[PDB]
Design an enzyme around this catalytic site. Structure first.
Site, short mmCIF file in Angstrom:
data_model
loop_
_atom_site.label_atom_id
_atom_site.label_comp_id
_atom_site.label_asym_id
_atom_site.label_seq_id
_atom_site.Cartn_x
_atom_site.Cartn_y
_atom_site.Cartn_z
CD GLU A 168 -2.84 -1.36 2.37
OE1 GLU A 168 -2.64 -0.39 3.27
OE2 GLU A 168 -4.01 -1.82 1.85
CE1 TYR A 299 -9.30 -5.56 5.50
CE2 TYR A 299 -8.07 -3.99 3.62
CZ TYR A 299 -8.06 -5.22 4.88
OH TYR A 299 -6.83 -5.47 5.30
#
Length: 460
Positions: A168, A299
């Site tokens: 990330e 998510y």
């Protein structure tokens, strides 16, 4: 029922600082996160990764737990400051730290679990931040990261065939240098873009090194993990549609376009101007096509509106509340994260079409709302987490077997409840409950669900 091909791998993912503990054991020296947790007000509950789930010491039990769950793979990260304590290419290498990870990997091999190794999961050695500002120094950061990568390929490459350079970079840059919410706590309208640029280059150099000196003899693959939500326009107005495209560029496109296509996307270049560094011709060549597979952390889904005031977000407003008041889905312990399985399906298809590389979902999970306040006997009946995985694995199955998106891996986040960065220990993401006072691991029902689902949905 439909089934994923036998080659499909599933398991769980973790990050070193979130689970290891033993911050100064066996020669490890501080990372920027160790430093960050000693700064008042930075961690919600005033906690740190000093102990976490004590997984450095309890590594064998964790491997046995993974095996008991029937996983095919395990994604974990290496603490750079355990391997080269001060981090640099001319700093002393730590044999004990290297041996710890070597032994861990060998146990995974003995158990038949495929290791997926993340080289950098946010724990930059503190010495490099003090020496030259870490990622802020182009030449030094690139050389040191490449050397670190090389050492890892040499130390573990004959057993590891699946590498992830960075986890990330959006978070590393935005949260660590844009709004200072994560280590090293910098706030700037320039550093996040510089750090992103240098990480893209460091990534590319490590990938070229792997491909040129290790790939043929070790037979593995290497990629980068990028995070992205599925984004939906708030309404059907041109402004909303454009805002959604702009939001995607600021979250994902600014990393994926250079790495998979060859250059920075148009909107961000226009908006940031000279604050967004320019790749040289040789750098463009090096960066273009520098990822063997598309690592994805996802998510939830967000609705996008034009009119945002935060440049780090791309001047958009994101949320989970529709114009008529309806919420996207079940609430989690974090406001930004709601259960929305369809978005996962749409995102997988989008990524396969846009970047044409096999997708490996390196992180997908859910934090039950208020779970930290539940005793183990109640925490194990994690209804909402089970429902989340039910919805997302269904989306995964549909995406591949029906839609035709090339997705080859899925890792649940996370194996154990652990240190959740600025949120401390309050947010619980594990499929395994951990009592921090005894370090006892207790499988939650979601663990049983995933083990059974993948056993039943992967060709025998």
């Amino acid at each position: 029922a439909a089934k994923l091909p036998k080659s499909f791998v599933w398991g769980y993912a973790t990050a070193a600082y979130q689970i290891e503990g033993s911050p100064d054991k066996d020669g490890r020296e501080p990372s920027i996160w160790d430093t960050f947790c000693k700064a008042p007000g930075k961690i919600a509950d005033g906690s740190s990764g000093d102990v976490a789930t004590d997984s450095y010491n309890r590594w064998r039990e964790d491997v046995q737990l993974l095996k008991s769950y029937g996983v095919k793979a395990y994604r974990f990260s290496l603490s750079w400051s355990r391997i080269i304590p001060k981090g640099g290419r001319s700093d002393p290498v730590n044999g004990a730290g290297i041996k710890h990870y070597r032994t861990l990997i060998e146990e995974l091999v003995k158990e038949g679990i495929t290791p997926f190794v993340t080289l950098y999961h946010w724990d930059l050695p503190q010495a490099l931040d003090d020496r030259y500002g870490g990622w802020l120094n182009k030449e030094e950061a690139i050389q040191d990261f490449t050397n670190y990568a090389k050492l890892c390929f040499e130390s573990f490459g004959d057993l590891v065939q699946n590498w992830i350079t960075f986890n990330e970079p959006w978070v590393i840059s935005v949260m660590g240098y844009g709004n200072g919410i994560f280590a090293p706590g910098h706030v700037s309208n320039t550093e996040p873009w510089i750090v992103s640029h240098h990480i893209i280059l460091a990534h590319a150099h490590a990938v070229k090194l792997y491909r040129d000196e290790f790939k043929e003899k070790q037979g593995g693959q290497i990629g980068i993990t990028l995070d992205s939500h599925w984004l939906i326009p708030y309404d059907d107005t041109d402004a909303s549609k454009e805002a959604t495209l702009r939001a995607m560029e600021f979250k994902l496109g600014r990393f994926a376009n250079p790495i998979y296509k060859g250059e920075y996307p148009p909107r961000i270049k226009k908006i940031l101007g000279d604050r967004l560094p320019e790749f040289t011709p040789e750098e463009i060549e090096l960066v273009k096509g520098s990822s063997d597979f598309f690592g994805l952390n996802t998510y939830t889904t967000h609705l996008v509106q034009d009119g945002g005031s935060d440049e780090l977000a791309g001047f958009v407003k994101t949320g989970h509340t529709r114009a008529d008041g309806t919420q996207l889905g079940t609430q989690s312990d974090m406001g930004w994260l709601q259960t929305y399985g369809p978005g996962f399906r749409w995102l997988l298809n989008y990524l396969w079409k846009a970047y044409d590389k096999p997708v490996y979902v390196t992180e997908n999970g859910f934090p039950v709302k208020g779970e930290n306040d539940l005793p183990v006997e109640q925490a194990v009946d994690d209804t909402d987490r089970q429902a989340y995985y039910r919805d997302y694995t269904e989306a995964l199955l549909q995406a591949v077997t029906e839609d035709g998106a090339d997705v080859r891996g899925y890792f649940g986040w996370s194996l154990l409840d652990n240190f959740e960065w600025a949120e401390g220990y309050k947010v619980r993401f594990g499929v395994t409950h951990v009592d921090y006072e005894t370090q006892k691991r207790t499988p939650k029902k979601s663990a049983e669900f995933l083990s059974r689902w993948f056993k039943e949905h992967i060709e025998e």
